[PDB]
C-alpha cells in the first residue's frame, strides 16, 4: 500500500509539473503579445524575462528544489520497480526544464485569423459532441443518434478542407485538438456485423 | 479488469427488490445516519452508525459482525461500480448521495477501514461519471484574443475556472477534507506506521489523484498540495 500511494503521489507530481510547464508557456505567450502590441500597436527584454522566470513562486518545494531532489533520490533506492522508474524519470526531467519549455513553445499555434477562430470553435463543438456520443456507446450499439454521428462525421470531413496550404494548417489544428484519440476510440467501439449504418460511419471515420 | 457479463448479471441479481433484505440500508435522519438491517429471521434492527462503532470498540460481537458486513457490502458496491457500469452506479447514487457519503467519510470516530471503504465507494461512484473527463494539462492551440497582457497565478486560476464546465462544484467539501487529512498525516511523526490508517491514506490519495486528473483542482491548490505530498513521502 505504501508503494501504491507513493506511485500515485509521483503521478500527481508529474501532473503538477505539466501544469507548471503550461503556465510557463502561457507566460511566454503573454510576454510576446505584450511586446508585439507595445512595439507595433525588445528582444533583449523578453529574453531577460524568460531567463528570470526559471527558478521563485513556481517552485515544486519551498526549499528551492532541494526537497524534490532528496525525495526522488530516496525513492530511487526502493525495490519497487515502477516507483524507481518514475523517480528516475522525474529526476532526469527535473534538470531539463528549459529544454522542455522551449520544445513545447516551438509548437505553439495561435489561430489569429477569424476563419481560424471559427474553425476552432466548430471543430471543438463537433469533437465534444462526438466524444459524448462515443462515451454512451451501449445506447446505440444496435435512432437519431446514428444520424447525428453521421452528420458530425460529414461536417468534420468538410472541415478537413482542400488545398495544400490550407490542408497543412487544418491538419496541424486537428492534431493539436486531440481528434486522433477520439476517432481511434470510436474505431475501437464494439460492433455487430450486418449493421449498415455502422459500416457507413466506420467508412466515414476511415 | 471488470468483466461486463458477470458484473451485469450480479447487478441484476443483487439489486433485485426481492433481495432487498440481504442488504443493509442506511438512512440520514435529523443530522445522523442510521443503519437498518434484517437478521436471519424476519426481524428488523435499526441503530446509529456512531453507536455501532462505540459498541464495536466496547467489544460487542454482533455489532462488530454487522459493521464488517456493512464494510464488505460497501466494497461489493464499489466493485460493482467499476469501469463506469451505470446500471449499478445510478442505483448506488440514488441510495447513497454525495452528502451522506461525505458525512460518513469526514467523521473520525468511525473505524478507519469503514472510512476507506466509503472513500473507495465515493471514488468509484461519483468521481468518475459522464460530466468528468480526462483533461490534458498542456494545450498547444491558443487563441490570440484569449492571451492576456498580464498573467499571474490568480489570473491563470480564473482562466481555468472559466474553462471549467460546471459552475457548481459538488466535491469542494471532499477536496477540503482531502487537504485536511493530508495535512494531518504529514503532521504525524511517522507518515506510514498504522496498518489501518495506511488503507485510508491510500484511498484518499487515489481520490485526490483522480480528481486532479479530472481538472477539479486549480493551479494554486495543486502547488499548495505539492508541499504536503512531498512531506508525506519524506
Coordinates of C-alpha atoms in Angstrom, one line a residue:
Chain A
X1 CA 0.0 0.0 0.0
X2 CA 2.9 2.4 0.8
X3 CA 4.4 1.8 -2.7
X4 CA 1.0 2.3 -4.3
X5 CA 0.4 5.6 -2.6
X6 CA 3.9 6.7 -3.4
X7 CA 3.4 5.9 -7.1
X8 CA 0.1 7.8 -7.0
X9 CA 1.8 10.8 -5.5
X10 CA 4.5 10.6 -8.2
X11 CA 1.8 10.7 -10.8
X12 CA 0.2 13.7 -9.1
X13 CA 3.6 15.5 -9.0
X14 CA 4.1 14.7 -12.8
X15 CA 0.7 16.3 -13.5
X16 CA 1.7 19.3 -11.4
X17 CA 4.9 19.7 -13.3
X18 CA 3.0 19.5 -16.6
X19 CA 0.6 22.3 -15.4
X20 CA 3.7 24.4 -14.4
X21 CA 5.0 23.9 -18.0
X22 CA 1.7 25.0 -19.3
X23 CA 1.8 28.1 -17.1
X24 CA 5.3 28.9 -18.4
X25 CA 4.1 28.6 -22.0
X26 CA 1.2 30.9 -21.2
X27 CA 3.7 33.4 -19.6
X28 CA 5.8 33.3 -22.8
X29 CA 2.8 33.9 -25.0
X30 CA 1.6 36.8 -22.8
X31 CA 5.1 38.4 -22.9
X32 CA 5.3 38.0 -26.7
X33 CA 1.9 39.6 -27.1
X34 CA 2.7 42.5 -24.8
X35 CA 6.0 43.1 -26.7
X36 CA 4.3 43.0 -30.1
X37 CA 1.4 45.3 -29.1
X38 CA 3.8 47.8 -27.5
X39 CA 6.3 47.9 -30.3
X40 CA 3.7 47.6 -33.1
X41 CA 0.3 48.7 -31.8
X42 CA 12.7 44.5 -27.4
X43 CA 14.1 41.0 -27.9
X44 CA 16.6 41.5 -25.0
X45 CA 13.8 42.4 -22.6
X46 CA 11.7 39.4 -23.4
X47 CA 14.8 37.2 -23.2
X48 CA 15.7 38.6 -19.8
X49 CA 12.1 37.9 -18.6
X50 CA 12.2 34.4 -19.9
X51 CA 15.5 33.7 -18.2
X52 CA 14.3 35.2 -15.0
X53 CA 11.1 33.2 -14.8
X54 CA 13.1 30.0 -14.4
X55 CA 14.0 29.2 -10.8
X56 CA 10.5 31.6 -7.3
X57 CA 6.8 31.2 -6.9
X58 CA 6.7 28.4 -9.5
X59 CA 8.6 26.1 -7.1
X60 CA 7.7 22.4 -6.5
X61 CA 9.0 22.7 -3.0
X62 CA 9.6 25.5 -0.5
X63 CA 13.3 24.5 -0.2
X64 CA 14.2 25.8 -3.7
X65 CA 14.1 22.4 -5.4
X66 CA 16.3 20.6 -2.9
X67 CA 13.4 18.6 -1.2
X68 CA 12.2 17.3 -4.6
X69 CA 15.7 16.0 -5.3
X70 CA 16.1 14.3 -2.0
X71 CA 12.7 12.7 -2.3
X72 CA 13.5 11.4 -5.8
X73 CA 16.9 10.0 -4.7
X74 CA 15.3 8.3 -1.7
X75 CA 12.6 6.8 -3.8
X76 CA 15.1 5.6 -6.3
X77 CA 16.5 3.2 -3.6
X78 CA 13.2 1.3 -3.1
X79 CA 12.9 -2.2 -4.5
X80 CA 9.5 -1.4 -6.3
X81 CA 10.5 -1.2 -9.9
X82 CA 7.7 1.2 -11.1
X83 CA 8.5 3.6 -8.2
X84 CA 12.2 3.6 -9.1
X85 CA 11.4 4.1 -12.8
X86 CA 9.1 7.0 -12.0
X87 CA 11.7 8.6 -9.7
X88 CA 14.4 8.3 -12.3
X89 CA 12.2 9.8 -15.0
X90 CA 11.2 12.7 -12.7
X91 CA 14.9 13.3 -11.7
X92 CA 16.0 13.3 -15.3
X93 CA 13.2 15.6 -16.4
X94 CA 13.8 18.0 -13.5
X95 CA 17.2 19.2 -14.9
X96 CA 15.7 19.7 -18.4
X97 CA 13.2 22.4 -17.7
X98 CA 14.4 24.9 -20.2
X99 CA 14.8 22.4 -23.0
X100 CA 11.2 21.0 -22.4
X101 CA 9.8 24.6 -22.2
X102 CA 11.4 25.6 -25.5
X103 CA 10.4 22.4 -27.2
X104 CA 6.8 23.0 -26.1
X105 CA 6.9 26.6 -27.1
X106 CA 8.2 25.8 -30.6
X107 CA 4.8 24.0 -31.3
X108 CA 2.5 26.8 -30.2
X109 CA -0.4 27.6 -32.5
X110 CA -2.1 31.0 -32.4
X111 CA -5.1 30.8 -34.8
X112 CA -5.1 34.6 -35.4
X113 CA -7.5 34.8 -38.4
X114 CA -11.2 35.0 -37.8
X115 CA -11.6 32.0 -40.1
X116 CA -9.2 30.1 -37.8
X117 CA -11.3 31.1 -34.8
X118 CA -14.5 29.8 -36.5
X119 CA -12.7 26.6 -37.5
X120 CA -11.5 26.1 -33.9
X121 CA -15.0 26.7 -32.5
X122 CA -16.8 24.4 -34.9
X123 CA -14.2 21.6 -34.6
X124 CA -14.3 21.8 -30.8
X125 CA -18.1 21.6 -30.7
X126 CA -18.1 18.7 -33.2
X127 CA -15.4 16.8 -31.3
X128 CA -17.1 17.3 -28.0
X129 CA -20.4 16.0 -29.4
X130 CA -18.7 13.0 -31.0
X131 CA -16.8 12.1 -27.7
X132 CA -20.0 12.4 -25.7
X133 CA -21.8 10.1 -28.1
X134 CA -18.9 7.7 -28.1
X135 CA -18.9 7.5 -24.3
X136 CA -22.6 6.3 -24.4
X137 CA -21.7 3.6 -26.9
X138 CA -24.1 1.0 -25.4
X139 CA -27.1 3.3 -26.1
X140 CA -26.6 2.9 -29.9
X141 CA -24.6 -0.3 -30.4
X142 CA -27.6 -1.9 -32.2
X143 CA -32.5 6.2 -33.7
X144 CA -31.4 9.8 -34.3
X145 CA -28.0 9.1 -32.7
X146 CA -26.8 7.4 -35.8
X147 CA -27.9 10.4 -37.9
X148 CA -26.2 12.8 -35.5
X149 CA -23.0 10.9 -35.7
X150 CA -23.1 10.7 -39.5
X151 CA -23.7 14.5 -39.6
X152 CA -20.8 15.2 -37.3
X153 CA -18.5 13.0 -39.3
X154 CA -19.6 14.7 -42.6
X155 CA -19.1 18.1 -41.0
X156 CA -15.6 17.2 -39.9
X157 CA -14.8 15.7 -43.3
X158 CA -15.8 19.0 -44.9
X159 CA -13.8 20.9 -42.3
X160 CA -10.7 19.0 -43.4
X161 CA -10.8 21.2 -46.5
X162 CA -8.8 21.2 -49.7
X163 CA -5.6 22.8 -50.9
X164 CA -2.1 22.0 -49.6
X165 CA -1.6 25.4 -47.9
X166 CA -4.9 25.2 -46.1
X167 CA -4.6 21.4 -45.6
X168 CA -1.4 21.7 -43.7
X169 CA -2.9 24.3 -41.3
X170 CA -6.1 22.2 -40.9
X171 CA -4.1 19.0 -40.2
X172 CA -2.0 20.9 -37.6
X173 CA -5.1 22.2 -35.9
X174 CA -6.7 18.8 -35.9
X175 CA -3.6 17.2 -34.4
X176 CA -3.5 20.0 -31.7
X177 CA -7.2 19.4 -31.0
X178 CA -6.7 15.7 -30.0
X179 CA -9.1 14.5 -32.7
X180 CA -7.0 11.3 -33.3
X181 CA -7.7 10.0 -29.8
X182 CA -11.4 10.3 -30.1
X183 CA -11.5 9.0 -33.6
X184 CA -9.5 5.9 -32.6
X185 CA -11.7 5.4 -29.6
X186 CA -14.7 5.4 -31.9
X187 CA -12.9 2.9 -34.1
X188 CA -12.5 0.7 -31.0
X189 CA -16.2 0.7 -30.3
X190 CA -17.7 -2.8 -30.2
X191 CA -19.7 -3.6 -33.3
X192 CA -22.1 -6.2 -34.6
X193 CA -21.6 -7.3 -38.2
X194 CA -24.5 -6.5 -40.5
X195 CA -25.5 -3.0 -39.3
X196 CA -25.4 -1.0 -42.5
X197 CA -25.3 2.4 -40.6
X198 CA -22.4 1.1 -38.6
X199 CA -20.2 0.3 -41.6
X200 CA -21.2 3.6 -43.2
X201 CA -20.0 5.6 -40.1
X202 CA -16.9 3.3 -40.0
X203 CA -16.1 4.2 -43.6
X204 CA -16.6 7.9 -42.9
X205 CA -14.2 7.7 -39.9
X206 CA -11.7 5.8 -42.1
Chain B
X1 CA -10.3 -5.6 -15.1
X2 CA -14.1 -5.6 -14.8
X3 CA -16.0 -8.4 -16.6
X4 CA -19.1 -6.8 -18.2
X5 CA -21.2 -10.0 -18.4
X6 CA -20.8 -11.4 -14.9
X7 CA -20.9 -7.8 -13.5
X8 CA -24.2 -7.1 -15.2
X9 CA -25.6 -10.5 -14.1
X10 CA -24.6 -9.8 -10.5
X11 CA -26.1 -6.3 -10.7
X12 CA -29.4 -7.7 -11.9
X13 CA -29.5 -10.4 -9.3
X14 CA -28.3 -8.5 -6.2
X15 CA -30.3 -5.3 -6.8
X16 CA -33.5 -7.2 -7.4
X17 CA -36.0 -5.8 -4.8
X18 CA -36.9 -9.3 -3.7
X19 CA -33.3 -9.5 -2.4
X20 CA -33.5 -6.2 -0.5
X21 CA -33.3 -7.9 2.9
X22 CA -29.7 -9.2 2.4
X23 CA -28.5 -5.5 2.0
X24 CA -28.3 -3.2 5.0
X25 CA -30.0 0.2 4.4
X26 CA -28.5 3.4 5.6
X27 CA -30.8 6.4 6.1
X28 CA -29.9 10.0 7.0
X29 CA -32.3 11.5 9.7
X30 CA -32.1 14.6 11.8
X31 CA -28.1 15.1 11.3
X32 CA -27.0 11.5 11.9
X33 CA -27.2 8.3 9.8
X34 CA -28.8 5.1 11.0
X35 CA -28.2 1.6 9.6
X36 CA -31.2 -0.8 9.4
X37 CA -30.7 -4.5 8.8
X38 CA -32.8 -7.6 8.9
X39 CA -31.4 -10.6 10.8
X40 CA -31.6 -14.2 9.5
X41 CA -35.1 -14.2 11.0
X42 CA -37.9 -11.8 9.9
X43 CA -36.8 -9.1 12.4
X44 CA -35.6 -5.6 11.7
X45 CA -33.0 -3.7 13.8
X46 CA -32.1 0.0 13.4
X47 CA -29.1 1.6 15.1
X48 CA -26.9 4.7 14.7
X49 CA -23.5 4.1 13.0
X50 CA -21.9 6.0 15.8
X51 CA -23.5 3.7 18.3
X52 CA -22.4 0.7 16.3
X53 CA -18.8 1.9 16.3
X54 CA -19.0 2.7 20.1
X55 CA -20.2 -0.9 20.9
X56 CA -17.7 -2.4 18.5
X57 CA -14.9 -0.6 20.4
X58 CA -16.6 -1.9 23.6
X59 CA -16.4 -5.4 22.2
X60 CA -19.9 -6.5 21.2
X61 CA -19.7 -9.4 18.8
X62 CA -23.0 -8.8 16.9
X63 CA -22.2 -5.1 16.4
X64 CA -18.7 -5.8 15.1
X65 CA -20.1 -8.5 12.8
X66 CA -22.8 -6.2 11.3
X67 CA -20.1 -3.4 10.9
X68 CA -17.9 -5.9 9.0
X69 CA -20.9 -7.0 6.9
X70 CA -21.6 -3.3 6.0
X71 CA -18.0 -2.8 5.1
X72 CA -18.0 -5.8 2.8
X73 CA -21.3 -4.6 1.3
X74 CA -19.7 -1.2 0.6
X75 CA -16.7 -3.0 -1.0
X76 CA -19.0 -5.1 -3.2
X77 CA -20.9 -2.0 -4.2
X78 CA -17.7 -0.2 -5.2
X79 CA -16.6 -3.2 -7.2
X80 CA -20.0 -3.3 -8.9
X81 CA -19.4 0.4 -10.0
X82 CA -16.1 -0.2 -11.8
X83 CA -15.3 0.8 -15.3
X84 CA -18.4 3.0 -15.4
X85 CA -21.2 0.4 -15.0
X86 CA -24.2 2.8 -14.9
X87 CA -26.9 0.2 -14.2
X88 CA -25.5 0.0 -10.7
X89 CA -23.9 3.4 -10.4
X90 CA -27.3 5.1 -10.7
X91 CA -28.8 2.8 -8.1
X92 CA -25.9 3.4 -5.6
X93 CA -26.0 7.1 -6.2
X94 CA -29.8 7.3 -5.5
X95 CA -29.3 5.0 -2.5
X96 CA -26.2 6.8 -1.4
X97 CA -25.8 10.5 -2.1
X98 CA -22.8 12.8 -2.0
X99 CA -23.7 14.4 1.2
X100 CA -24.3 11.2 3.1
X101 CA -21.1 9.6 1.9
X102 CA -19.1 12.8 2.8
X103 CA -20.7 12.8 6.2
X104 CA -19.7 9.2 6.8
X105 CA -16.2 10.0 5.4
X106 CA -15.3 13.1 7.4
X107 CA -16.2 11.7 10.9
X108 CA -13.2 10.3 12.7
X109 CA -14.9 8.3 15.4
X110 CA -15.8 5.6 12.8
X111 CA -13.3 2.8 12.2
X112 CA -10.6 3.5 9.6
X113 CA -11.5 0.5 7.4
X114 CA -15.1 1.7 7.1
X115 CA -13.8 5.2 6.1
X116 CA -11.6 3.6 3.5
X117 CA -14.5 1.6 2.1
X118 CA -16.6 4.8 1.9
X119 CA -13.7 6.6 0.1
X120 CA -13.5 3.8 -2.4
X121 CA -17.2 3.9 -3.0
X122 CA -17.1 7.6 -3.5
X123 CA -14.2 7.3 -6.0
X124 CA -15.9 4.5 -8.0
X125 CA -19.4 6.0 -7.9
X126 CA -19.5 9.8 -8.1
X127 CA -16.0 11.0 -9.1
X128 CA -15.9 9.1 -12.4
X129 CA -19.1 9.7 -14.4
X130 CA -20.2 11.5 -17.6
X131 CA -19.6 15.1 -16.6
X132 CA -16.0 14.2 -15.6
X133 CA -13.4 13.5 -18.3
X134 CA -9.6 13.5 -18.6
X135 CA -8.1 16.9 -19.4
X136 CA -4.7 17.4 -20.9
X137 CA -2.6 19.7 -18.6
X138 CA -0.9 21.3 -21.6
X139 CA -2.7 22.6 -24.7
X140 CA -0.9 23.7 -27.9
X141 CA -3.8 25.6 -29.7
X142 CA -4.3 29.0 -28.1
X143 CA -6.4 31.8 -29.4
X144 CA -4.8 35.2 -29.9
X145 CA -7.6 37.0 -28.2
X146 CA -7.6 34.8 -25.0
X147 CA -3.9 35.7 -24.4
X148 CA -3.8 38.3 -21.5
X149 CA -1.3 41.1 -21.4
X150 CA -0.6 40.4 -17.7
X151 CA -0.7 36.8 -16.3
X152 CA -0.3 35.7 -12.7
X153 CA -1.3 32.6 -10.6
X154 CA -4.7 34.1 -9.8
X155 CA -5.4 35.0 -13.5
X156 CA -4.4 31.5 -14.6
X157 CA -6.7 30.0 -12.0
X158 CA -9.5 32.3 -13.2
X159 CA -8.9 31.2 -16.8
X160 CA -9.0 27.5 -15.7
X161 CA -12.3 28.2 -13.9
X162 CA -13.7 29.8 -17.0
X163 CA -12.6 26.7 -19.0
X164 CA -14.4 24.5 -16.4
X165 CA -17.8 23.3 -17.4
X166 CA -19.7 23.1 -14.1
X167 CA -20.0 26.3 -12.2
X168 CA -21.2 24.4 -9.1
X169 CA -18.7 22.1 -7.6
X170 CA -20.1 19.1 -5.8
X171 CA -16.7 18.0 -4.4
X172 CA -15.5 21.2 -2.7
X173 CA -16.2 19.6 0.7
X174 CA -14.4 16.4 -0.4
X175 CA -11.4 18.5 -1.6
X176 CA -11.2 20.3 1.7
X177 CA -11.4 17.1 3.6
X178 CA -8.6 15.6 1.5
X179 CA -6.4 18.6 2.1
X180 CA -7.1 18.5 5.9
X181 CA -6.4 14.7 6.1
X182 CA -3.1 15.0 4.1
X183 CA -2.1 17.9 6.4
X184 CA -2.8 15.9 9.5
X185 CA -1.0 12.9 8.1
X186 CA 2.2 14.9 7.3
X187 CA 1.9 16.3 10.8
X188 CA 2.4 12.8 12.1
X189 CA 5.9 11.8 13.0
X190 CA 5.6 8.5 11.1
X191 CA 3.7 9.0 7.8
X192 CA 3.1 5.2 7.4
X193 CA 3.0 3.4 10.7
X194 CA -0.5 2.2 11.3
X195 CA -1.8 -0.5 9.0
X196 CA -5.4 0.6 9.3
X197 CA -4.5 4.3 8.6
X198 CA -2.5 3.2 5.5
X199 CA -5.6 1.9 3.8
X200 CA -7.5 5.2 4.3
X201 CA -4.4 7.2 3.2
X202 CA -4.3 5.2 0.0
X203 CA -8.0 5.7 -0.6
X204 CA -7.8 9.5 -0.1
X205 CA -4.6 9.8 -2.2
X206 CA -6.2 7.9 -5.0
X207 CA -9.3 10.1 -4.8
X208 CA -7.1 13.2 -4.9
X209 CA -5.2 11.8 -8.0
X210 CA -8.4 11.0 -9.8
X211 CA -9.8 14.5 -9.0
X212 CA -6.6 16.1 -10.2
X213 CA -6.6 14.2 -13.5
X214 CA -10.2 15.4 -14.0
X215 CA -9.4 19.1 -13.6
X216 CA -11.1 19.7 -10.3
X217 CA -8.1 21.4 -8.8
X218 CA -6.7 24.9 -9.6
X219 CA -3.0 25.6 -10.1
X220 CA -2.6 27.3 -6.7
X221 CA -4.3 24.4 -4.9
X222 CA -2.1 22.0 -6.7
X223 CA 1.0 23.9 -5.8
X224 CA -0.1 24.0 -2.1
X225 CA -0.8 20.3 -2.2
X226 CA 2.6 19.6 -3.7
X227 CA 4.4 20.5 -0.5
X228 CA 2.1 18.4 1.7
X229 CA 2.5 15.4 -0.7
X230 CA 6.3 15.7 -0.6
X231 CA 6.3 15.9 3.1
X232 CA 4.2 12.8 3.2
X233 CA 6.7 11.0 1.0
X234 CA 9.6 12.3 3.1

